[PDB]
Structures are given as C-alpha cells and as structure tokens.
Structure 1
Amino acid sequence: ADFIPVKGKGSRVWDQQGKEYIDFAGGIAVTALGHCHPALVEALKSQGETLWHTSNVFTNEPALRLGRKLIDATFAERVLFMNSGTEANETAFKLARHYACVRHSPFKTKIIAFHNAFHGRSLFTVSVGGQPKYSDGFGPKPADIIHVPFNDLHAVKAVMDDHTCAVVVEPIQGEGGVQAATPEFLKGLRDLCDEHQALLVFDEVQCGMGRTGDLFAYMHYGVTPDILTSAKALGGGFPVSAMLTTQEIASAFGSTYGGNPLACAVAGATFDIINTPEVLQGIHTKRQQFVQHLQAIDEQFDIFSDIRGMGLLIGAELKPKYKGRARDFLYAGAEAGVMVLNAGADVMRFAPSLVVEEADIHEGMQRFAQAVGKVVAL
C-alpha cells in the first residue's frame, strides 16, 4: 500500500495528506461496523475506565455477558475467548484432537481440510490451511492433515475413516476466491462426521458475525457444526476471538473461559448491533446495491466472469483476459480513492462495514468504475 490511513469514520478513511477514501475492504472483513462507531467507542471508553485485564484464572463481567449472548444465539453451550482467529482455530483444532484422543482413541488423529483454505499463520493452522506455499519452509509440519478439493464431497468420503478426528471447513472460503459451500457438500460433511465419530469444525472467522446476512453462515445453511470459530467482525476492530462448542466437547479440556474485559465489552456492543433483524436485513439490501454496480461495471467494461459470495462478502472473478491482475485493479482503486480486496490474483473482493451507508456504496462504486476504466483504457 502507498498510503497511511490516519483517521476513519464509518466507511470513510483519511490518509496523512487528508485524501478521503471509501472503505470497501474493512481491514479484511474486520471493521464490520465501520471506523470509530459511536457505540463501540462508548463501550471502549466505559470499560477502559473500569478494568482492562484479567488473566484466565478469572472471568469478568464483559466476558460472561458476551458468552451468554453467543450461547443464547447459537448452538453453543460453551465459549472460550482468545485474541485472534489464529488462536481460536488453534484451540478448536487442539480440542477436536484432544476430544478424539480421550473419548475414542489416541490414534484417531486425521484432520480433513480443503485446498485453498485459510485458517491462520501459526504452524499448526497454516498446515491445516490449504495453500502449500504458505506452509512450506518452516521445518516439520504437524502431521495427519489431509487436503481435498473444496466442495468435493466424494473426496471427503474417500479419505475419512475411523481414524479421523475432524473435518475443518470455511463455509465460504474468503481468501480462496470467495467460494461458497454447496448445500449438499456442507450437509454431507455433517453426515460423514456423524458416521465416523469426527467433529465438524466451521471456521467462521471471516464469514461469521453477520457477514453473510445471518449471524453465522451455518444458520444460512441449516447445518450445525460441533465447533465454530469467530473473530474479525466479533470485535469490530478490537482483537478478540471465540471458540464455540457444546458442554460434551468442551469437557475434554462454567460456561465461558478467558476473554479480555476490554475486548469483550467492545465485542458485546458489536454483537448487540449486528444481531438485530434490521441490521441483518440491511446486509442483503446492501449486497444487492453492490452487485447492481458490479453488473453495471461489467456491462460497460466486460471484466467479470462471475459475481459471488454471500451477504457483504462479495467476490467478482476477472475474465481470462484479466486473469492474474486483481492487484492492478486494487491499486487503481486506491488511486481512485476506494479501498478494495483481492481473493487470489483472479478475484476482486469486497467486505465493507455491514452498516455501510447507501451513499458510500454509490460513491465508492463510482470510484471503482473510474479505476476499472483507467485500467481497461490501457
């Protein structure tokens, strides 16, 4: 990036020179309520005057309240809080392994994961991730992880057995080209996990906390996982994460564990806004506003082969002529004053605030059209 953001309000961001940008990136789907949302600032300041920190020896009122919100709203009966999606995934993957070890057999260790998956950058999580380029070169990887293609239920059936402890999947692969699970695939994972006494682990770090227009993507699909991870949007920009599971599974390790008081106070305020009928409905309204602009851009410039994703996770795949050039459009966008994402070198990605104003959708998309125009003019 060739600029330094210094200030943000809602979906507008200013750099050191006072240039104004429309933010359709959200810090990679993190600032789900935009920058410096008044309710989140209020929660930060109030808890900031009270108590910031407890060790995991203790609980605290913000953690208890956030845990109760998540438990009441989801399949979860137990919640463990951490800082990042990577830590939440470490916890989920360790827990699925440990549960298999103590409830079934120490030899029940296979983890099935998917090509193009992203689960974090720790050694274990990057090894469960499905991009060999990112996991190569750090010495011996944690073993017993098998990768098959996303959306290939037959391949999962083929590799799964009584020695399998988990299937780990992103219901929508965000980094991996914004690819959504098909209904049959996701239901199939649930059935195969039931058959083999393995745990189904949904990584909802990117697609959770309202991103799809349901509180969690699993709710859209109607497929209940055993363990779910959440981060990013959960804290609206404050680092916080959660691992959600049942009492039966968590017992392999009170309804909550961990949680920074400050982080959890902010996440509570974020949860209270995102988990409302009006905000969730609005995510679908706004998706259509974005998609209509992307279609208009494609009609004018002929650059997209597909527009996909769910809610306000949007992917627009570039036509073969522009394969490999997502970064060129990202940089042209920045020049035109709009912040966008890629999802690999072939895919444009958008992950704006879930409450992005219509006026900002229109302005940012006009700027993006200008960017596309400048690139295609060459």
Structure 2
Amino acid sequence: TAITRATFDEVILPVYAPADFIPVKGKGSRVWDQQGKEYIDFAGGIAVTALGHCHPALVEALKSQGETLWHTSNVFTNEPALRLGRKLIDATFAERVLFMNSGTEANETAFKLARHYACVRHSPFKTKIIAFHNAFHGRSLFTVSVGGQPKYSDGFGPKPADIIHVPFNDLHAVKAVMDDHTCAVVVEPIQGEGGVQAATPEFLKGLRDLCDEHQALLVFDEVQCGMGRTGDLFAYMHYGVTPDILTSAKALGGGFPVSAMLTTQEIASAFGSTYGGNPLACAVAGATFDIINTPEVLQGIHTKRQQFVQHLQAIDEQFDIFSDIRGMGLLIGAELKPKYKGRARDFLYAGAEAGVMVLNAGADVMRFAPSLVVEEADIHEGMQRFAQAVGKVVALE
C-alpha cells in the first residue's frame, strides 16, 4: 500500500503526466519529497503560491477561520467575503466582486456577464466575443472555446458559438472583426501559457478604444498575471488601461482554491457589493492580499526579477541557449534559441533532477513564477541548480 509515482497511473484520469517524485511538505520556496530530497520552487504550482508554502500568516488565517465557520451558500454573505470584497473595491476600479473557486469559474461568470449585459442592454444579437490565438482561459467547454488553442477545444462536440480568434498584439485584426454585434474582447494582459507574451501598450490601449467605439466590454483575464505577479497589484495598473471586467485566481488565495470576478455596479446590475465567497477561502485570500498589496512587497518583486534575469543572462553567456527573456515582475519567460526549439521539457526534467522546479510555456519557453517573497538566497541557490541542469543538457550537445 505504499503511495508511489506508479500509484498515480492506477488512480487518476490520464490527463496529467506528473513528475517522478512526490512533494509532501513545503516551507517558503523549499519543498521536500517522500525521500526528503530538497527542491527550490520557482514554479509556484503554476504561479499560485505567491507567498510560498505554508506562509505563517496564511496558515494563521486558515486555522482561525477553520475554527469559526467554513461555509455559507450564496444565499448569504459572510465576514471574510465582505472584507475581501472591500479590499478589492478600495484597491481597484471594481465596485462589485463575485467570488468563485477556480479561474475557469471566474471566467465563466465574466463571459456570461459580458454576454448577458449585451443581451439586455443592447440586443440579443450582440454576441460576438473576440479572443486571441494562444489564449488560455480555463477548461470548461465555454472558457476553452474562448481560449485560443484548438487542440484543447476540439473533440467535445458542438462548441458555444460566436467566438472569433485573432493574433495576440494585432490591433488591426481586432479592428477588422469588431462591430456593433460584438459584446466583448477577452484578453490576458500577459499571455502566460502562450509563451509569456506581454501586450504592447498601443495594443492594450487600442482594445479599450475599440470596446468604447462598439459598446463592447473589455475583459481582462488576470488569473495568472494578477495579484502582484507583475509588480503591480494587477497588470492593468502597469498599463494604465482600465477594463470593464477583470478576473483573478491563482495567487489570490496563495494556494487556497479561490477566484474573483471584478466589475462595476452598472455592469453587474445586468444580473450589496459582493456575491458568494467561501468563508475559509476569503479569510485566506484576505491575509494574502494584505501582504501582497504593500509597497515593500511590490518593490521587492522588481528587485527579485532582476536577480533572476541576471542569472538567466549569465546562463546564456555561458551556454548560448536563450533568444529572449521576457514577462513582467515575477512572471519570467526565457525563450530557447532555434537549436533548442521544442526542448523546454528536457530542461525542466534536468532542472528537477538538479533540485529546482521550473515551468514551460509551450515547448520553446522556460517559465518562472516563484513566490513573490522568494528569499534572495533561494533565488541564487535555485538558479545555480538550474545552471547545473543547463550544463548537463548542453554537455550532451
């Protein structure tokens, strides 16, 4: 009855191919497997553990609320949800906040709301949604159809219709497809899964102007780039472009399943300042928000980015593997040179062997999404491990 890696194949649907070792415990940016091997975590559970593992403040919030009240249905509100709603409203453009569990659910509510607002405020025929190639918005049938990767939306029967995809950063293409029958433009300000590609300023500003012209809602999916990831509370604040609806998840709860959809009173009235929210989830997300939304933590994200980028540059000087280093704050993408095209997974595996956890963003890009408070010592140790992994792969060349 020992639980091993082999156990996964006997138990879970074959939709994942997980690592050969099993993390069992973590503190900060260090993680231990069943053999007590120690890893440096630059993956963050895919940009989720924004304050690292078992952060004392988050554990305290969990325990305190866990002794008090876990659950209310959406018939009720609860103090943690009201508190978190207020902090989001005070800190952002939002006047109304709806809480869910996952990024997928938050996006379902955002896309349903944009559709419904158009239906009741303009016309039942105003249904087109513009989205972008390589976008990722979740795995429900609707959200994966708004997602821009046909490989993930093919094969589930008839897709919800009236979704049009154009290239990310192509403002002319958006202009071309938008019209009075368009209800929404949905965009990630930085495409995380899609190779860590940031919107240009002109593109994002252009989406706002086109949404205004056509009476469409601009929906920012900040599930991955939000909650401090870029070094601002939300990426829209870096750009100075205010969306009509914004979604947040991943870092919002520091690891606890929680998500949010933020909008205005005018738009939300198509459906008090908050709706939903698990008491336990919202208590934890409140503690997370209180730490991430501080000048010091947000400044540190930029300091830490440069510490990572200097190491990636040193690695490239030595080994000649990267064509581009991009992203914002502590979402970092390092694109492999053509010689190593398609081999991101080879470097991820060698990384894991060397004791560092990193991500891909497609087969050509390495992705780093560490805790926003990752200690400098852990940045240097993990990046030395990564350099060692790169060395081992390159020596085979």
TM band (smaller chain): over 0.9
Instruction: Specify the alignment match of 1:12 in structure 2.
Output: 30
The DSSP-based 3-state class of the residue aligned with 2:227 is coil
Segments of 4+ in structure 1 off by > 4 A? none
Q: Quote the offset at 1:76 in angstroms.
A: 0.1
CA distance in 2, matches of 1:317, 1:80: 36
Q: Quote the offset at 1:146 in angstroms.
A: 0.1
CA distance in 2, matches of 1:243, 1:188: 23
CA deviation map 1:107-142 (0-9, x unaligned): 000000000000000000000000000000000000
1:249 and 2:262 matched:
no
CA distance in 2, matches of 1:2, 1:360: 23
CA distance in 2, matches of 1:141, 1:332: 39
Instruction: Specify the alignment match of 1:161 in structure 2.
Output: 179
Q: Quote the offset at 1:220 in angstroms.
A: 0.1
CA deviation map 1:63-105 (0-9, x unaligned): 0000000000000000000000000000000000000000000
Identity of aligned pairs, percent? Answer: 100
The DSSP-based 3-state class of the residue aligned with 1:121 is coil
TM-score (norm 2): 0.95
CA deviation map 1:292-348 (0-9, x unaligned): 000000000000000000000000000000000000000000000000000000000
CA distance in 2, matches of 1:46, 1:340: 33
The DSSP-based 3-state class of the residue aligned with 1:124 is helix
CA distance in 1, matches of 2:360, 2:345: 7
CA distance in 1, matches of 2:145, 2:34: 38
Q: Quote the offset at 1:359 in angstroms.
A: 0.1
The DSSP-based 3-state class of the residue aligned with 1:88 is helix
The DSSP-based 3-state class of the residue aligned with 1:40 is helix
CA deviation map 1:29-85 (0-9, x unaligned): 000000000000000000000000000000000000000000000000000000000
1:73 and 2:95 matched:
no
CA distance in 1, matches of 2:158, 2:267: 29
Q: CA RMSD in A?
A: 0.2
TM-score (norm 1): 1.00
Q: Quote the offset at 1:357 in angstroms.
A: 0.1
* Gap runs ≥5 in structure 2: 1-18
The DSSP-based 3-state class of the residue aligned with 2:159 is coil
CA deviation map 1:226-284 (0-9, x unaligned): 00000000000000000000000000000000000000000000000000000000000
* Gap runs ≥5 in structure 1: none
The DSSP-based 3-state class of the residue aligned with 1:167 is strand
Q: Quote the offset at 1:171 in angstroms.
A: 0.1
Instruction: Specify the alignment match of 2:16 in structure 1.
Output: none
The DSSP-based 3-state class of the residue aligned with 1:361 is helix
The DSSP-based 3-state class of the residue aligned with 1:31 is coil
Instruction: Specify the alignment match of 1:140 in structure 2.
Output: 158
Q: Give the length in aligned residue pairs.
A: 378
